[PDB]
């Protein structure tokens, strides 16, 4: 499923992310934009052989099991394909463990490089929330 900016925003607030661990809604939307282009089915391979899954590109090294990542953990106790559903519940819930892990949203390299220190508000501009 490919979300609209505001739809994704709406769903993310609904699922408890607005100011989750201090991170306003615009951060999560911006991160989603640059990780997956709002597309729930997005997959990409990392240089280490792990794969990134979903709307927020959650990775198999630590957070999920995809059956082909040797020497990895499954810290969100999920198969990585659960992260590609049209329902974002699993991705959000897992994002909350990641984001609560010490490094905050810096765990997402696209957040720190593209969203951090920028006007993240603009990502929710014109949405009913």
Residues 6+ apart with CB under 8 A from 7: none
- The total number of residues shown for the chain amounts to 129
Residue 2 is encoded by which pair of tokens?
């490919």
| Strand ranges (E), the chain | 43-45, 51-53, 58-59
- 3-class DSSP state of 73: coil
Experimental structure resolution, Å: 2.4
Q: Where does the chain break, by residue before each gap (C–N > 2.5 Å)? A: none
CATH code, 13: 1.10.530.10
Nearest Cα residue to 127 out of 24, 23, 21:
24
80 in Cβ contact with 65 (< 8 Å): yes
The reply to whether 18 sits in an annotated binding site is no
Number of domains in the chain: 1
Residues with active-site annotation:
35, 52
Backbone angles phi, psi at 75, to 5 degrees: -65, -20
Instruction: Supply the range of the domain harboring residue 30.
Output: 1-129
CA atoms within 13 A on the CB side of 85: 12
Give the 3-state DSSP-derived string for 50-71, with helices as H, strands as E and coil as C: CEEECCCCEECCCECECCCCCC
State CA 103 to chain mean position distance: 14
């Amino acid at each position: 499923k490919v979300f609209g900016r505001c739809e994704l925003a709406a769903a993310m607030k609904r699922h408890g992310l607005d100011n989750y661990r201090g991170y306003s809604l615009g951060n999560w939307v911006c991160a989603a934009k640059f990780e997956s282009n709002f597309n729930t089915q997005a997959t990409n391979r990392n240089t280490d052989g792990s794969t990134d899954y979903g709307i927020l590109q959650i990775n198999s090294r630590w957070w999920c099991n995809d059956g082909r990542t040797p020497g990895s953990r499954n810290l969100c106790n999920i198969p990585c394909s659960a992260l590609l559903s049209s329902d974002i519940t699993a991705s959000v819930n897992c994002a909350k463990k990641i984001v609560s892990d010490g490094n905050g949203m810096n765990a997402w390299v696209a957040w720190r490089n593209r969203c951090k220190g920028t006007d993240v508000q603009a990502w929710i501009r014109g949405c009913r929330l």
